[PDB]
Amino acid sequence: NLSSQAKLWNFIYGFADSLVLKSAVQLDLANIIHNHGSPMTLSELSLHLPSQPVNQDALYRVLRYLVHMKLFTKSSIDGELRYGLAPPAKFLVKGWDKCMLGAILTITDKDFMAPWHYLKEGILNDSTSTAFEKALGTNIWDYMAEHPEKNQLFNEGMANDTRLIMSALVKECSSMFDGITTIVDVGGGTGTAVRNIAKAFPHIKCTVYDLPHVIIPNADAIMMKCILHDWDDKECIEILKRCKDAVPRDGGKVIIIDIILDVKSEHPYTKMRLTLDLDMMLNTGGKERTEEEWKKLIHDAGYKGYKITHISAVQSVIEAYPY
Amino acid sequence: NLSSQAKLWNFIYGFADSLVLKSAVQLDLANIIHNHGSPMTLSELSLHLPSQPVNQDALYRVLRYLVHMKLFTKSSIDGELRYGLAPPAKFLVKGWDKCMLGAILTITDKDFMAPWHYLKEGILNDSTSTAFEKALGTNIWDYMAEHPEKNQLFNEGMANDTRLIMSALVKECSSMFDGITTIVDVGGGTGTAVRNIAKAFPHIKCTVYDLPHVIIPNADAIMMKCILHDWDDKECIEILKRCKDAVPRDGGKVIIIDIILDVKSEHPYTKMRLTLDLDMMLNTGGKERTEEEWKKLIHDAGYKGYKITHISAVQSVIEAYPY
Ligand SMILES: [K+]
Incomplete structure (x- = not known):
């Protein structure tokens, strides 16, 4: 019976949504992907970023969060993991x-x-x-x-x-x-x-x-x-x-x-x-x-x-x- | 068709949940009310607070938010508005x-x-x-x-x-x-x-x-x-x-x-x-x-x-x- 405790935990971490999203806007992730015309891999997305070299792992863990928020998509295409935009990201x-x-x-x-x-x-x-x-x-x-x-x-x-x-x-x-x-x-x-x-x-x-x-x-x-x-x-x-x-x-x-x-x-x-x-x-x-x-x-x-x-x-x- | 835009707006303001809740813990609102044994009015709750005098209006607007978060309850008892605890607040x-x-x-x-x-x-x-x-x-x-x-x-x-x-x-x-x-x-x-x-x-x-x-x-x-x-x-x-x-x-x-x-x-x-x-x-x-x-x-x-x-x-x- 822990949905109650989970609401509260999620309320406590409500700021994580704000700030993960903040980084996605800062890194302009959504535009880049849309401007690419096709879903991008980690390294492809990484190379489009303002400065180099990029920490792939941090980028992956933030993507996973964005994807779980249902703002971004993760899809396996060929043998590659490719990231797209879920519908709410049109506003990004x-x-x-x-x-x-x-x-x-x-x-x-x-x-x-x-x-x-x-x-x-x-x-x-x-x-x-x-x-x-x-x-x-x-x-x-x-x-x-x-x-x-x-x-x-x-x-x-x-x-x-x-x-x-x-x-x-x-x-x-x-x-x-x-x-x-x-x-x-x-x-x-x-x-x-x-x-x-x-x-x-x-x-x-x-x-x-x-x-x-x-x-x-x-x-x-x-x-x-x-x-x-x-x-x-x-x-x-x-x-x-x-x-x-x-x-x-x-x-x-x-x-x-x-x-x-x-x-x-x-x-x-x-x-x-x-x-x-x-x-x-x-x-x-x-x-x-x-x-x-x-x-x-x-x-x-x-x-x-x-x-x-x-x-x-x-x-x-x-x-x-x-x- | 704006539920999409609302998700995102709510994600943007996810930090508001964290920080309203923060103030409720800081002011120890839930304990006070539970320790009171009965739902409290604005002024009653106000007088139990660490320092005085309290800004009733700010307290009211924060309560309204807590109540909308479904952590606190608002109820009319006699001619008075009284605040209680919704179930998730047991953890408060x-x-x-x-x-x-x-x-x-x-x-x-x-x-x-x-x-x-x-x-x-x-x-x-x-x-x-x-x-x-x-x-x-x-x-x-x-x-x-x-x-x-x-x-x-x-x-x-x-x-x-x-x-x-x-x-x-x-x-x-x-x-x-x-x-x-x-x-x-x-x-x-x-x-x-x-x-x-x-x-x-x-x-x-x-x-x-x-x-x-x-x-x-x-x-x-x-x-x-x-x-x-x-x-x-x-x-x-x-x-x-x-x-x-x-x-x-x-x-x-x-x-x-x-x-x-x-x-x-x-x-x-x-x-x-x-x-x-x-x-x-x-x-x-x-x-x-x-x-x-x-x-x-x-x-x-x-x-x-x-x-x-x-x-x-x-x-x-x-x-x-x-x-
Ligand atoms: K902050």
Whole structure:
């Protein structure tokens, strides 16, 4: 009756998955194999590696792990053992929008895992520093500046997540813009994000309004893409109150894009949605809300109701109705 | 069709499981709740914590994660939200042989996870240092000396694993000693381990023989408990050849206790067995062998055959037959 003990053992070693995968991305194993067009032997794979000579044995023991994770395949072809890609590894190949290689390099950076070791000090009072600041002795801004590459990759990461979010929005939720002729994108900075809407719906005038902050505009609809999960309840309701007055009684609305935590859910992203919240707490200081918490914010903002639409992304869409 | 992408996302964040669990052990959440005898509210649990005041919100968000991991329970009792222990958390309670709290504190120590960030340099040649030495700038011996507590816990850990191994051995595999009247425990140091055999089978004379090493004896059977996974093939076969000559043609045998890697296995410990091998490679420099590799060692030692017995432990038992 030891499946119980095994769950826990596997939870203890959950980091081994992260870090084996990290090495596979670092060594770019999946691309190399796909770019090869045919499954590669140990020595063939070895010779494609950045530096030489390679420790075949270490490479073999890591492959065995990747293969057991079911990300890579091991197959006997002729008298040779050849390694291919199991289906999940398509996200380990370059040259398509869902490539996760950057995400991986970022998330599994030793320094970016570091703050997760201060979960206990997050809970016990010592302090006002973020777990990040406690583990690295600087704030992220500073950190990113002193690590411009990590920063560049990180920005490209965020830019790419916005394309994917925006794209699922216009494609999956286009009906949400029916009747709309103007939209204000709050926190849309440059306007790259809203531009997806202007492009898909040329009949809609898209305005960006960033909020002053320390280091309104009228429309049929207001949009907030991943804004609110940064603001606490006070700010969220105020902004949500400004938005009410900015959109028309007759049909106006606010479209919110953010994670909806639902722990009682069997959706595959449930776990990751939870993880993003602890990550929020460790780094930014925001949180991800449950539907009940969204309900209450909206209710406390004087709104009539809301409708949640699920999309092919971590985040969800909340159409919040002011009148 | 995104279960594929979710596996990978969950693999990326596999470390979050390790580190949330780490905080739960650090805060000793499970014991406290069990010692309370009844499920506790946030504030009740908070007041039992080492230092004060506690960040209720951080504690709540970590609990939610633990509860989603199905280690803890969340239940509404009266008008209060109360947290209990899901079955896997029994291993998070003190006072029984299978308590895993020490294991957890050890394995999830930031410094002991550190070497897993050097998997890529394990593969690429720079160097002769262990991943451990590369991440901490010292060897373990030194390290342990400068961290006597971590060392004490670690030793107690190894001592406890030997009790459990030995105990499963005499209880599950007692028939393996039938007919045996003498046994030599190679690498049994003090003799604590073999003493389990002397105690269970008083009719057996138990000798310890440690091997000289830098910083034989005759018996019906020889025993090697977790010796061989440290020696490479050369040494393994030599030792296995000495053992042949030390035990009788008529029934003599060598009993090996060590992990048998079997990647094509649905046994719950398969993953962890793999993980222990990468851990070996990162720290000690040994490896864990597949049955085929054991077969070949034994075959190359001139043995007739072997029999594998599975026991309730990570390791397995190989009776290797010399004649
Ligand atoms: K780490």
